[PDB]
């Protein structure tokens, strides 16, 4: 009788009071429990009829279910599908998340669990704070709700309310004996989220309640996070707390000026110089000498600038915008170090701007510094190499001689990142195995784009030797995609994706130059994927044998003359002349095919099923296994 359960779920989800009354009419107690407790799936979520009735805000349906039928408010289901697959959520949690005060009042009063604990210890009060409705939070808290109960990561009810722009619920919680000194898994308190979001009222009400400013796990006080999030008005109120001393104020002002200098949304120059000069003034106005700062050595990425340690050194860079960007990057680096999460993103954005306004050399310097910083922190540099491929392709399309040491460094960090990605794939079992494999394939494609760009540049002998050394290292690393394609199958396959940006205009696979460069670096020419197709079974399938015949000819003579087997048979029992589908490719392969007694004897051995195990030399067992 699952049909009645499905119709009842539909009637409860869509608020059909009369239809649900007609459906549950003429039913027995066991039937009533079966229909009103059954778990139904209607896209992404497991939910009972009452869970989906309260989650859709159908007050009449929920009140009808609890008045006559002895339904229980402790059922288990799933509610959301925006990165939030949470089990064990009762009807209170669904009602609070959907923000329906009219159902939660009719649900609690009928014997409900106000402080239910789901799988990730999320109280229904947490959902009501997430929505921000004061009426639901107040009703729950008045009905014996715990405020200090948090999830496994210690994200209390107050912190999620402080993260969002809800003011009334935050003020009410701080008025209801809440704890303003919660410590999350990363050390973040309530002030960090409220400051980074940009809510002045939440921060003011917290510092009114003795918020007890403490540095988070990643060496960042709330002032530093507020300044890093480019929130000026948030930072300029914690200085009145009288416990901030002076160095914290100075570093907050300097970080705020830095973040204003190099940001996308709120990009300021008058405000940047105003705050930087305020910080330097408060540094150098003490009178008993100064309040000096330790400064990193001149970083080659930002020219040769040792930031600014002189009153006539900031007054003389008010009128320059590149100098302000460089100084902001330098102070943000010396404040945040290099291992912080959000220290490299302004560098990446400034590099993107410099690429946009045709400053390709400074773009390259800044973006190599960004990749070096991210490699020190071991973050996900899979998009960064793609952006390098796009920038270099734009360089070649503009007939600009790209510097070869830069390409060597990019390739070295590409092979290091590919090794890191292989380690990550070997580590991440199943939680993000598809994401890891997608990142790995993207990294291999970016390395191939860099190789093709390298073939498009006339480098010297030493530079070409270094590029060959990096390609040699990655080839001997032997990467393999999810389809078993090595770096040679993709260099000859016409189906390898090319990024929609300028990389289409330069890196056009298949390339005879890329394949020749790989084969000069000891590429496994006889490499076999999991399907069976070799490096030669793939190229002969090329659908353009006349348009770029040279790019075909010089790629089907480079394979065969190096180490390829012309007659080797894949797992589908297909000679490369059989898997050709092109007269030109078939003839161009047949002209390179030298018949030999070994291939004929191996084919005659394999055809009639002769037991060739341990009766032939070990190097001929794989030979017979080919044909």
């Amino acid at each position: 009788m699952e049909g009645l359960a499905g119709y009842v779920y539909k009637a409860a989800s869509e608020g059909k009071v009369l239809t649900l009354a007609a459906l549950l009419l003429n039913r027995s107690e066991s039937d009533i429990r079966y229909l009103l407790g059954y778990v139904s799936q209607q896209g992404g979520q497991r939910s009972t009829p009452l869970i989906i009735a309260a989650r859709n805000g159908h007050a009449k349906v929920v009140r009808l279910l609890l008045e006559h039928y002895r339904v229980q408010t402790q059922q288990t289901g799933t509610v959301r599908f925006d990165g939030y697959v949470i089990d064990g959520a009762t009807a209170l949690w669904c009602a609070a998340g959907a923000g329906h005060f009219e159902v939660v009042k009719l649900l609690v009063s009928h014997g409900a669990n106000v402080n239910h604990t789901t799988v990730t210890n999320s109280t229904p009060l947490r959902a009501a704070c997430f929505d921000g409705r004061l009426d639901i939070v107040k009703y729950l808290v008045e009905n014996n709700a715990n405020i200090s109960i948090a999830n496994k990561y210690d994200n209390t009810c107050l912190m999620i309310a402080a993260y969002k722009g809800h003011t009334d619920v935050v003020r009410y919680l701080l008025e209801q004996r809440a704890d303003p000194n919660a410590k999350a898994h990363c050390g973040a308190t309530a002030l960090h989220f409220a400051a980074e979001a940009g809510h002045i009222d939440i921060v003011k009400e917290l510092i009114k309640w003795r918020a007890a400013i403490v540095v988070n796990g990643h060496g960042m006080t709330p002032l530093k996070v507020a300044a890093e999030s480019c929130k000026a008005d948030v930072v300029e109120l914690l200085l009145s707390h009288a416990d901030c001393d002076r160095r914290s104020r100075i570093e907050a002002l300097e970080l705020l000026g830095a973040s204003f200098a190099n940001d996308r949304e709120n990009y300021d120059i008058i405000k940047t110089y105003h705050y930087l000069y305020l910080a330097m003034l408060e540094r150098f106005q003490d009178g008993d000498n100064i309040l000096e700062k330790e400064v990193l050595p001149p970083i080659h990425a930002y020219g040769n600038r040792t930031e600014c340690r002189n009153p006539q050194e900031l007054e003389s860079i008010r009128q320059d915008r590149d100098a302000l960007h460089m100084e902001g990057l330098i102070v943000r680096e010396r404040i945040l170090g290099a291992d912080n999460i959000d220290v490299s993103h302004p560098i990446i954005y400034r590099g993107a701007v410099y690429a946009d306004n045709m400053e390709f050399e400074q773009c390259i310097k800044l973006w190599l510094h960004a990749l070096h910083l991210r490699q020190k922190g071991n973050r996900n540099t899979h998009k960064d190499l793609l952006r390098f491929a796009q920038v270099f392709s734009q360089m070649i399309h503009l007939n600009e001689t790209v510097k070869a040491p830069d390409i060597e460094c990019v390739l070295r960090c590409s092979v290091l990142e590919i090794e890191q990605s292989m380690n990550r794939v070997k580590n991440i079992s199943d939680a993000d195995v598809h994401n890891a494999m997608d990142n790995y394939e993207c990294n291999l494609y970016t390395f191939l784009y860099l190789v093709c760009i390298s073939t498009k540049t006339q480098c010297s002998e030493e530079d070409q030797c270094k590029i060959n050394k990096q390609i040699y290292n990655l080839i001997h690393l032997d990467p393999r995609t999810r389809e078993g394609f090595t770096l040679l199958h993709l260099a000859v396959n016409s189906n390898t994706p090319v990024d929609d940006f300028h990389t289409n205009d330069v890196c056009s696979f298949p390339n005879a130059l890329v394949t020749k460069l790989l084969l000069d670096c000891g590429a496994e020419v006889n490499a076999v994927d999991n399907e069976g197709n070799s490096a030669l079974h793939i190229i002969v399938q090329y659908n353009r044998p006349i348009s770029d015949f040279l790019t075909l000819h010089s790629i089907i003579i480079s394979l065969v003359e190096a180490g390829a087997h012309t007659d080797m048979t894949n797992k589908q029992n297909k000679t490369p002349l059989d898997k050709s589908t092109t007269g030109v490719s078939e003839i161009l392969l047949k002209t390179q095919m030298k018949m030999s007694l070994k291939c004929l004897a191996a084919r005659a051995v394999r055809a009639n099923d002769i037991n060739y195990q341990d009766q032939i030399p070990r190097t001929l067992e794989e030979f017979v296994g080919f044909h």
Binding site: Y84, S122, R126, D131, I160, I348, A352, V353, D356
Partner: peptide
């Protein structure tokens, strides 16, 4: 262009 391409939820569960 280049700038027009650059455009934690586990800890932010409701």
């Amino acid at each position: 262009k280049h700038s027009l391409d650059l455009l934690k939820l586990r800890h932010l569960s409701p």
